[PDB]
Amino acid sequence: RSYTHAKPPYSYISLITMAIQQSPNKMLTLSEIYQWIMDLFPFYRQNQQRWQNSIRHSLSFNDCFLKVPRSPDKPGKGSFWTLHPD
DNA sequence: AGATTGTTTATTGAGA
DNA sequence: TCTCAATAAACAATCT
Ligand SMILES: [K+]
Secondary structure: OOOOOOOOOOOOOHHHHHHHHOOOOHHHHHHHHHHHHHHHHHHHHHHHHHHHHHHHHHHHHHHEEEHHHHHHHOOOOOEEEEEEEO
């Protein structure tokens, strides 16, 4: 049987920012961001289709998130995302 | 191909 | 009314 959780009081900027700040390298992949968010806020275990679309939109749309490429000799899926140094 | 990641554009909704 | 946040969606790049 399923259970209603209430949306926590954070914008996607805030959610992403917190995820990154917490990370030991100060950077996370997109899927790591998803993980951190879901692990912590069970509200986000539903409707993953739309809220993840929002996250992706946020990373690209907002200048405060910076794409870090993976090393040539350490390849993988997607880039890391860190905070713009502003 | 098939899915994930990323970008971009347009709309919509909420709150001041 | 107007800005900004969130949503929806089209389409490309890049992984599996
Ligand atoms: K960006």
